[PDB]
Amino acid sequence: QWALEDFEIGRPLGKGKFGNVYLAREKQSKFILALKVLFKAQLEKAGVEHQLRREVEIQSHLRHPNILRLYGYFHDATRVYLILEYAPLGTVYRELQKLSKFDEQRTATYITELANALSYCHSKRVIHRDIKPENLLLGSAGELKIADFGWSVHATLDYLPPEMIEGRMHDEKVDLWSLGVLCYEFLVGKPPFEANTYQETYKRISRVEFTFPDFVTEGARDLISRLLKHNPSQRPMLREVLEHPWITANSS
Ligand SMILES: Cc1nn(C)cc1-c1nc2c(-c3cnn(Cc4ccccc4)c3)c(Cl)cnc2[nH]1
Secondary structure, eight states, rough: OGGGGGEEEEEEEOOOOOOOEEEEETTTTTEEEEEEEEEHHHHHTOOHHHHHHHHHHHHHHOOOBBBOOOEEEEOOOOOEEEEEETTTTTTTHHHHHSSSSHHHHHHHHHHHHHHHHHHHHHHHHHBBBOGGGGEEEOOOOOEEOHHHHTTTEEEETTOOOOOHHHHHOOOTHHHHHHHHHHHHHHHSSTTTTSSSHHHHHHHHHHTTOOOOTTTHHHHHHHHHHHHOOSGGSOOOOOOHHHHHOOOOOOOH
């Protein structure tokens, strides 16, 4: 029986649609962790109880150095608390906008981290689907740790694949797309399909319309091209990515 006053709540780490996340310390052990607080009301209202059960049930039974651990859960009358591992070095999201953009070496590292983490998820038939820089956290060693399985399951739209947005059947190849989009954003500082309008982005994703800035190598260009295909099955397995020369050359 875990309950709210077993923890002391620190600065608010993230804000969210439904709930927030704070730094927290369990009193008995002095254990630092992140503590997601969700609001029953808003969840019921948007009817996502199932997806929360999913997230929890999925992230709870996952073991990998690049996947934010989920230690436990509990809830009171009004809210639900998710007890999570804490990422000292923050989010890649801020990391990017802070650094403007990433070199090929950092980029290719973060990708192999993801690809590893994703292989794993797929090796358990789990599609994250919602992979974006505000879901990628940095460990104390600066390692990438994916998180927020609020849209995870089994076999804004910038990071969604066409099949998804059009309302069609999808699979592990979803993450491959995201891996693509993500790789592009690291190098360029902006997602390939970004746009002022929703339905404008939709079109660009649907028609697959992107164009590399001058400063991206044929190598990078390559990977990204192979990775962003309208046809899910044209997209490389994760093994293929991991051994993509440009990644080999520069990953670490
Ligand atoms: C931000 C930030 N700066 N520094 C130095 C560390 C962090 C940090 N954030 C986290 C976080 C964290 C934050 N946001 N989110 C996602 C979210 C937020 C609000 C509602 C729903 C989902 C996770 C976590 Cl879980 C786990 N560890 C974290 N560490």
